[PDB]
């Protein structure tokens, strides 16, 4: 039944309507702003103990 609600999932137009310490960690995850990809950009890596921090490959 496409139009009707089967199980708990209902589809109208292009939007779908579904019926539904961990909580503190979960809501913390939901609120993170930066992407993982962006976070690498600020991080520089040292090849050697006293070497310069290299950020991006040449």
């Amino acid at each position: 039944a496409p139009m009707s609600d089967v199980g708990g999932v209902l589809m109208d137009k292009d939007a779908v309507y579904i019926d539904i310490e961990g909580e503190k960690l979960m809501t913390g995850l939901q609120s993170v702003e930066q992407s993982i990809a962006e976070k690498f950009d600020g991080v520089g890596l040292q090849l050697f103990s006293n070497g310069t921090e290299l950020h991006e490959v040449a």
Partner: protein
């Protein structure tokens, strides 16, 4: 009703439209309840999707059982008890009961290799292994969904720490699980990956943060569809080409048909493809093409007949496309051997004229005298010398998989191809047949497991020249930073894996997890001299085995599961039953890799020499914070070495490898009798004792091995060349030279022992041969005993022989090879060998007379 985030449906819809796969990570106890919803969204987007679902778990299912009758009884009792209404079934049970779900343990992941499934579920995140992850994802068709359930509290806590700050790693109270940690970061890079909670809230950490619904709706199909109409009249080509799924596959079949048409028996066709690109389907179709063309004697060879099931299945589909009917045009013969599990061995065809398709073991090359066509499926897994023999005066089809199953290193295929340069025809299949080319998931998968790594020639070395080995310096590699997924580390990890895969013969995908997680393992790199990312020249992997590992083992047994194994400590234990060597801490060189093109420049030997110095002490906390990263490479001085007694190696015995280790002062201690099935090579263990350490036990081990080798040359090592056996003896004797002590020394044969070994008549018989009054065949009796005494060194300095003569005596006495067989091996005329053989025995007679 809660409005679901528009990102989740847009991802599934986009994947179906583009036939790209999508990864969903569900975090929460109720994660299972969301799977029915995701399945419904997948189907509603397109009704052409495959409905089968793959469920993978480790030991237990999450709160249910896959036995229909058992669930029904529990439901019926609950209904009778009144706990549940008569006809109520919440969505999860309805999803399991109706849908076609295949429940598979992680251990038996080999069963699912052939099949294809619409959706994949991986129940347990912690137990994930590279092989289980590559095998399962490859079975998801385009537009399918891969679901991973991170339900464990610790896994969530790892997810929490990693997202808030990337550098920090959550480490509980010896397995580090770096692969799972490195795995999580790789998802953030993936554009088709969403990480979600049990409430269907999109956690922002995922890479698919900005997915937008694509507008409503390829060139490859157009280039494929058109080719099919143009050949529809041309039977048998039209029916067979119709089965092709991709442009590359059709070209391969047409090229195979072309070779079948030429009818010339001196050509080789080499098919190279990635796994799942349809190599077996193309070969099976071509075998059907050769059947209709008229070929009578068609052969198929593979390491086992069981692997050929897919090939045989497509042959029948080719036969069906050609109108052949079972039990009328062809008959199927299955194996009676229980080991092959009723695998198809032979198909006899009765149309027009009698034609036969049959499976042959690769070793049985003698029967190929009348062969018209042999199909070598998975030639990578067959030993090279056997493959050489199989290349006879007939049409040859070779199928080799690159980075599939165990397969082989890419260079070994190049070493195969360069040998062919017999006219050679090369075909490559690139397009995958289960999904769109360039799927982000596949590119994601290859990056994570480092499968598609290719070695690259460095122009900078050419401009500056190859560094002299003395200039190079060995640097320790910090594993934590290497598997941190920083772009520099990923590129360096990319380069290290290239040397790994290229050189050695077989590498399983689990090897990456073994390197990252195992605590005993350490990594060393022979970087070029410092003056850009440094590119390695030689990489060594060490595994600390001995008394040091007992603490880890005791902890593992406390957990209730022994971890890993100590090969050399145990191997020596059964052979010699030496209690001391078990307590002796030592290191095992798991693998040494060098650039093949820079082979013979001594980089490998240089790396070992520096490695030996480091553990000797001649060069005398960087763990990631546990709830800014440490340097990637550590100089030897910066880290203190462990206290070690010996360095051990384990490898398949080959002349090049044995010579390499022999030059590095290693001593053989054991040589396995049963050759390894994949390679045909015998596993050999060699040990090296460091200075400042007691060396008596090694010498006793070496002497015992030499005696065992001499007696065992007849049983299973008769295949070894006489030079090879002589060299292995020589290396062991070098261990005696290591000991300047004279406490142990070889003993010269007495008169009494000589009398017992040889009766007086035998001495007369030997003397007559020296004087030429006697034939050779009568003295066959004394040769093996003479060889035992000579290589036992009982004669001593009185009798000595050249290298060629020693090979001759070793062959007849110990290998039991005939004289004429020796003539071929040593490239000598048969008459010459007998003359040299007589010269040896005259020296033998003179010594005995001198003793008398």
């Amino acid at each position: 009703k809660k409005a679901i985030d528009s990102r989740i449906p847009s991802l599934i819809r986009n994947g179906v439209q583009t036939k790209q796969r999508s990864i969903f990570v569900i975090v929460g106890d109720r994660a299972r309840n969301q799977l029915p919803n995701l399945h419904y969204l997948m189907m509603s987007a397109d009704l052409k999707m495959n409905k089968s679902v793959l469920w993978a778990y480790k030991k237990k299912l999450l709160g249910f059982t896959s036995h229909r009758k058992k669930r029904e009884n529990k439901i019926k009792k609950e209904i009778k008890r009144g706990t549940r209404e008569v006809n109520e079934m919440d969505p999860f049970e309805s999803f399991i009961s109706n849908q076609n779900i295949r429940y598979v343990y992680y251990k038996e992941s080999e069963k699912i290799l052939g099949n294809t499934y619409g959706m994949c579920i991986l129940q347990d995140f912690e137990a994930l292994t590279p092989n289980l992850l590559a095998r399962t994802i490859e079975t998801v068709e385009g537009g399918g969904i891969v679901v991973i359930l991170l339900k464990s509290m610790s896994s969530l806590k790892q997810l929490y720490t990693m997202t808030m700050d990337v550098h920090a790693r959550y480490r509980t109270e010896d397995v580090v699980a770096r692969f799972n940690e490195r795995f999580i970061l790789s998802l953030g890079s993936n554009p088709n990956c969403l990480v979600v909670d049990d409430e269907l809230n999109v956690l922002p950490l995922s890479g698919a943060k900005n997915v937008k619904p694509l507008p409503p709706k390829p060139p490859k199909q157009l280039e494929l569809q058109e080719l099919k109409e143009s050949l529809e009249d041309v039977q048998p080509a039209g029916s067979l080409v119709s089965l092709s799924k991709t442009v590359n596959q059709a070209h391969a079949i047409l090229s195979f048909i072309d070779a079948i048409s030429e009818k010339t028996l001196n050509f080789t066709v080499a098919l190279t493809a990635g796994r799942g690109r349809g190599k077996s389907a193309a070969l099976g179709i071509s075998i059907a093409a050769a059947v209709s063309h008229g070929y009578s004697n068609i052969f198929v060879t593979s390491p086992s007949p069981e692997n050929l099931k897919t090939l045989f299945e497509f042959i029948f589909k080719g036969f069906d496309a050609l109108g052949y009917q079972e039990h009328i045009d062809y008959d199927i013969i299955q194996s009676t051997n229980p080991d092959f599990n009723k695998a198809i061995v032979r198909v006899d065809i009765k149309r027009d004229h009698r034609q036969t398709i049959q499976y042959i073991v690769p070793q049985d090359h003698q029967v190929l005298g009348q062969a018209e066509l042999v199909v070598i499926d998975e030639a990578a897994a067959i030993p090279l010398p056997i493959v050489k023999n199989l290349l006879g005066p007939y049409l040859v089809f070779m199928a080799s998989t690159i980075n599939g199953y165990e397969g082989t290193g890419r260079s070994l295929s190049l070493k195969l191809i360069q040998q062919l340069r017999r006219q050679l025809r090369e075909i490559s299949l690139d397009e995958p047949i289960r999904y769109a080319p360039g799927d982000p998931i596949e590119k994601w998968l290859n990056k994570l497991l480092c499968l598609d790594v290719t070695l690259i020639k460095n122009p900078r070395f050419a401009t500056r020249g190859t560094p002299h080995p003395s200039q190079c310096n060995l640097f320790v590699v910090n594993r934590d930073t290497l598997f941190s997924y920083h772009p520099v580390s990923e590129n360096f990890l990319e380069k290290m894996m290239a040397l790994y895969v290229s050189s050695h013969y077989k590498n399983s995908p689990n090897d990456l997890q073994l390197m990252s997680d195992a605590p005993a393992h350490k990594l060393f790199v022979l970087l070029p001299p410092i003056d850009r990312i440094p590119d390695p020249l030689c990489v060594i992997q060490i595994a600390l085995e001995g008394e040091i590992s007992k603490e880890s083992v005791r902890n593992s047994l406390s957990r209730g599961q022994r971890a890993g194994g100590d090969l050399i400590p145990w191997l020596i234990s059964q052979q010699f039953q030496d209690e001391e060597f078990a307590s002796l801490s030592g290191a095992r060189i798991v693998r040494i890799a060098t650039n093949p093109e820079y082979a013979s420049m001594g980089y490998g030997s240089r790396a070992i020499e520096l490695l030996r110095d480091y553990f000797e002490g001649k060069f005398t906390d960087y763990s990631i914070k546990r709830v800014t990263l440490p340097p990637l490479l550590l100089k030897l001085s910066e880290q203190p070495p462990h206290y070690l007694h010996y360095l051990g190696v384990s490898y398949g015995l080959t002349q090049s490898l044995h010579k390499f280790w022999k030059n590095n002062s290693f001593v053989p201690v054991y040589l396995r009798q049963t050759a390894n099935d994949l390679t045909g090579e015998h596993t050999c263990v060699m040990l090296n004792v460091l200075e400042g350490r007691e060396s008596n036990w090694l010498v006793e081990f070496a002497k015992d091995f030499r005696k065992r080798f001499l007696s065992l040359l007849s049983y299973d090592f008769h295949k070894f060349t006489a030079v090879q056996a002589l060299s292995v003896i020589e290396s062991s004797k070098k261990a005696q030279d290591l000991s300047d002590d004279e406490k142990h020394d070889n003993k010269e044969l007495t008169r009494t022992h000589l009398d017992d070994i040889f009766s007086p008549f035998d001495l007369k018989r030997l003397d007559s041969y020296s004087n030429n009054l006697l034939d050779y065949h009568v003295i066959g009796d004394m040769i093996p005993m003479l060889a035992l005494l000579y290589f036992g060194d009982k004669m001593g300095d009185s009798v000595k022989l050249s290298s060629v003569q020693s090979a001759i005596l070793l062959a007849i006495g110990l290998q039991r090879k005939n004289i004429d067989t020796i003539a071929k091996e040593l490239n000598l005329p048969s008459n010459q060998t007998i003359a040299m053989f007589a010269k040896i025995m005259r020296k033998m007679s003179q010594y005995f007379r001198q003793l008398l």
